Design a protein around this ligand. Structure first.
Ligand SMILES: Nc1nc2c(ncn2[C@@H]2O[C@H](COP(=O)(O)OP(=O)(O)O[C@H]3O[C@H](CO)[C@@H](O)[C@H](O)[C@@H]3O)[C@@H](O)[C@H]2O)c(=O)[nH]1
Ligand SMILES: Nc1nc2c(ncn2[C@@H]2O[C@H](COP(=O)(O)OP(=O)(O)O[C@H]3O[C@H](CO)[C@@H](O)[C@H](O)[C@@H]3O)[C@@H](O)[C@H]2O)c(=O)[nH]1
Lengths: 392, 392
């Protein structure tokens, strides 16, 4: 069959671009595939398969539609006359795409691959799952099935998770310039400083732990870009002052904040250099910044939310259940509800993993578990198996 | 003594407006008090005490200092030459007035009436507690004393709480327009639809309670302005669909939003009308609203936060403890951390008070307990004692 995939361009170094570099060349040997690549930063990584540069074509026609190029998708499908059109992004973006090709010449058969991260997304977006043209839906996890079914979806739903592979680098500690901290156990959170990822709880818990164990050789690593909503050292300073502990400043310095944007391998070096990988976010479609440490044999503390909860655990990970629920509607146009973990639960989780006997045991568990997990070849073969069932 | 209070003008229908209307006339008989009244809505409510209309004077000088009239305070103090100056606001506003009188000619003693609302307010505001002109600090509740100390306060700290004066009104639900709901038990949340107040939780717990008991004669009431940030019916609607319960739109109608602003009479009428008073906010300095329903012998469900926790005995009231803690830095320039109750805990509370024998019992309990509290005259006298102590 002739397939059209509407998603991130192969040049994009994002979460979406990561999977598009992997999934497309694997379906190329199964079906004739042509791509509608968006937000293109440079040239096409693939040498053979046809890919449309939607950002440059938008620049040529004289538009600034953020790089998505909705207005030209109508003309694009009419020429390429596909058997199946796949859409891969968050609720909002699909909503604009289906609105754009409402007057599209070819009678195609639409498949959705939604980026869902929170339950109870806004009502003005559920119409995409009931769309009389969408014949198939792809979810990132088992947890989203019930939701997608609640949003009024009468068509077959297929689970399409992700696989990940980080470079295993020996002597990583020294190479990222952490040589001075050889004695300390290092906790890592690679998540970006946004509300969803709740680094305020991370940094909050770090301060509680440090205050009750002021002499533990430990460091807490995290990232943050210029003047984002949470000032992480400021949050930690205030909780250390409230705790009554002496040497607030030296204790505060135990939280190490990276501000520069790293290369793909500095990220890999960072993963190898550390001892515990942490994610305490309120919403997860999948949670790449955790699975990436599981292959290296690092023990894991995760919030039991969304995709992370389904993907993990034969009791191989430290899972913290959300203690409360709030509305996320003020965050963005997607909205919904998310689960917040208790900070003190994160403190319990930390003291658990300052014991090296524990890090060794669970780090061995996660690696042996993620061994069984489906690779990109297993996943992409499941993608086409779902496509064949919708034609005959 | 000559005393100047920088605070809300008589006409202001806010939290600060209410306590200013009560405190000023009572200090007037002991001392000469003149008011730098800010944010005026019109005529001064007091016939004889001197109240300065700071907002209109601001307009006369063609300034827009949001009715605070920072530019005017310095000159106002130099003229009146008061013995003491009381600044009654939050830390940012106090900060700004302190800089305003930075180049003041009159040597004067400053007393701060701080409205705190969360632990861990930003450190760049802490300076106001150890400002050299600051001679004393007044706080609203016992819980805030240890925070102000942690912030580095070396001056006397006094507790100045609040009293509540709501009239008892006969035939109340007929008068507010709720005569169609005689059999229904009415839960009342009088709080403003802001983030702090967590009406997203209230509404969400209402939805979960309704889906649990579809035929329970119950109504939930709350408030919201033109275009706030939580669309309450939206949150409610989405949760009902999730539970799978039928007759969604009728069940949704049980949650009643009041968009219309209310006069002092109608607020009092609402309290009289309803069967259970609810406050599920993540931050309270003292926590008016709930205390307003307690003098009428109405049962209260409250979040055990800030001043609400100090003020009510756990035996006379249904207290819910926070389950999770989050940063608030994104909300305001003040910031801090606040505690959030579990939505399922609020459900337990709602089902506890659907039985009338519990409402009768806990109603009698609060009325008897709040009876033993200090009145406004007890509070005003304590205020004037504190000032005398600081003078000689
Ligand atoms: N090169 C580089 N990469 C970085 C850097 N910082 C983070 N990354 C990488 O950025 C990727 C982003 O992963 P997520 O954090 O899990 O994705 P997201 O922003 O939460 O958004 C969605 O993406 C995934 C689905 O494609 C989901 O895992 C996730 O739940 C969510 O739906 C991770 O692989 C992380 O290693 C950096 O400084 N440099
Ligand atoms: N006139 C009028 N008053 C209203 C209305 N709605 C609410 N109010 C009044 O608003 C008053 C104050 O509300 P609070 O519960 O105290 O919250 P807050 O003022 O917004 O927040 C902070 O300020 C207070 C300081 O005195 C603290 O009591 C409170 O805990 C918190 O720190 C209550 O007495 C209530 O009667 C209305 O529609 N009209």
């Amino acid at each position: 069959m002739k397939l059209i995939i509407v998603g991130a361009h192969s040049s994009v170094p994002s979460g979406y671009g990561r999977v598009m570099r992997a999934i497309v060349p694997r379906i190329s040997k199964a079906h004739e595939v042509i791509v509608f690549g968006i937000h293109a930063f440079g040239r096409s990584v693939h040498a053979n398969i046809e890919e449309f540069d939607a950002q440059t074509a938008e620049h040529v026609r004289g538009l600034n539609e953020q790089g998505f190029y909705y207005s030209g998708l109508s003309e694009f499908i009419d020429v390429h006359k596909p058997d199946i059109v796949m859409i891969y992004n968050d609720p909002i973006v699909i909503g604009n795409y289906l609105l754009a090709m409402g007057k599209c010449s070819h009678r195609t058969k639409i498949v959705l691959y939604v980026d869902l991260v929170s339950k109870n997304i806004r009502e003005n977006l559920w119409w995409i799952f009931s769309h009389p043209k969408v014949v198939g839906v792809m979810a990132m996890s088992k947890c989203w099935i019930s939701d997608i079914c609640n949003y009024g979806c009468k068509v077959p739903i297929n689970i399409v998770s992700h696989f990940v592979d980080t470079k295993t680098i020996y002597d990583a500690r020294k190479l990222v310039g952490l040589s001075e901290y050889n004695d300390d156990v290092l906790f890592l959170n690679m998540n970006r400083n946004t509300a969803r990822k709740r680094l305020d709880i991370y940094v909050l818990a770090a301060a509680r732990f440090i205050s009750k164990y002021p002499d533990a050789k430990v460091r807490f690593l995290c990232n943050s870009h210029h003047e984002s909503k949470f000032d992480l050292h400021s949050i930690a300073l205030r909780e250390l002052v409230a705790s009554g502990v002496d040497n607030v400043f030296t204790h505060l310095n135990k939280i190490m904040i990276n501000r520069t944007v790293l290369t793909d391998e500095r990220v890999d070096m960072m993963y190898n250099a550390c001892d515990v990988i942490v994610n305490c976010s309120s919403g997860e479609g999948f949670g790449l910044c955790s699975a990436e440490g599981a292959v290296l044999g690092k023990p894991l503390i995760i919030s039991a939310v969304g995709g992370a909860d389904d993907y993990f655990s034969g009791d191989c990970v430290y899972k913290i259940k959300p203690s409360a629920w709030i509305s996320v509607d003020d965050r963005d146009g997607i909205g919904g509800i998310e689960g917040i973990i208790d900070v003190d639960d994160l403190v319990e989780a930390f003291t658990f993993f300052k014991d090296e006997k524990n890090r060794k045991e669970y780090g061995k568990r996660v690696q042996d578990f993620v061994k069984t997990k489906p690779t990109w070849d297993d996943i992409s073969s499941d993608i086409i198996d779902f496509f064949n069932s919708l034609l005959r």
